[PDB]
């Protein structure tokens, strides 16, 4: 697909067995999801942006479907105001910026 | 150009006659640059990121050349961790996401 940027590039993702809406975010190194009680081992991490840092839980090798495209990788879980698909997964679904 | 996402989509911009490096950020509504001087009037504003809210200076109708493509639009100046080109200007230079 081609997604214009007149509005926020929100798309449907699937993780665990939850469908969520998430930003396709070229400015995010990592994928950061709103708080959810995922199974498995995790490690603590702090990630920074505008306003400062938040504490997150790093889960590895989590399968995620993004607009029907399969991905699997690291997902950070914490008190983000928006679900963010970062470059670690955008590359996996073949996403590019074009102009 | 087509820009893949295995690396941060950093580009050179020209603004106020100065060259800077900035991140093409589809997860950002607004363009936010690190502390700098710009001429003309500005308005105090607040924006919210992953870590909380910050104060910024809103400069309107500012010309900015991004990777050789011309935009003229709003630029926010404040304590962002990195210069970010948000959707208000990405749309001007005809940027889309594709996969
Ligand atoms: C600031 C950039 C460099 C990084 N951010 C991604 C942005 O796309 C972010 C994603 C994002 C979007 C919204 C809310 C939180 C985060 N956008 C914004 O902060 C700006 C603020 N804002 C905004 C919000 C409200 C009013 C005016 C505004 O301009 C807006 O529209 O975009 S991030 O969310 O902090 C981030 C994501 C993954 C990461 C990371 C940091 O480190 C490791 O892995």
A85 contacts B83 by C-beta, under 8 angstroms: no
Could you tell me the resolution of this structure in angstroms? Answer: 2.0
Can you read off the two tokens belonging to residue A98?
A: 């074009």
Report the DSSP pairing between strands A69-78 and A52-66. antiparallel
Determine the Cα angle at A34 with ends B3 and A41, to 5°: 95
Distance CA B30, CA B88 (A): 6
CA nearest to B67 within chain A? A99
Q: Does B35 touch chain A (CB under 8 A)?
A: no
Q: Name the structure determination technique.
A: X-ray
Closest of B35, B34, B13, B23 to residue B87, by C-alpha: B23
Distances (CA, A) of A98 to A34, B4, B90: 28, 9, 10
Q: Looking up tokens 């102009």, which residue turns up?
A: A99
Please report, for the domain that includes residue B53, its CATH number: 2.40.70.10
- Smallest Cβ–Cβ distance between B5 and the set A52, A81, A95 belongs to A95
Closest of A21, A11, A34, A30 to residue A73, by C-alpha: A30
Question: Domain range for residue A18?
Answer: 1-99
Number of domains in chain A: 1
Determine the Cα angle at B27 with ends B24 and B30, to 5°: 75
B57 contacts B5 by C-beta, under 8 angstroms: no
B79 contacts A76 by C-beta, under 8 angstroms: no
């Amino acid at each position: 697909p081609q997604i214009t940027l007149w509005k926020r590039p929100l798309v449907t993702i699937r993780i665990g067995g939850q469908l969520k809406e998430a930003l396709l975010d070229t400015g995010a190194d990592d994928t950061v999801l709103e708080e959810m009680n995922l199974p498995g081992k995790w490690k603590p991490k702090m990630i920074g942006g505008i306003g400062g840092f938040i504490k997150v839980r790093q889960y590895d090798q989590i399968p995620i479907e993004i607009c029907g495209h399969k991905a699997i990788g690291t997902v950070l879980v914490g008190p983000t105001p928006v679900n963010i698909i970062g470059r670690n997964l955008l590359t996996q679904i073949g996403c590019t910026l074009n102009f």
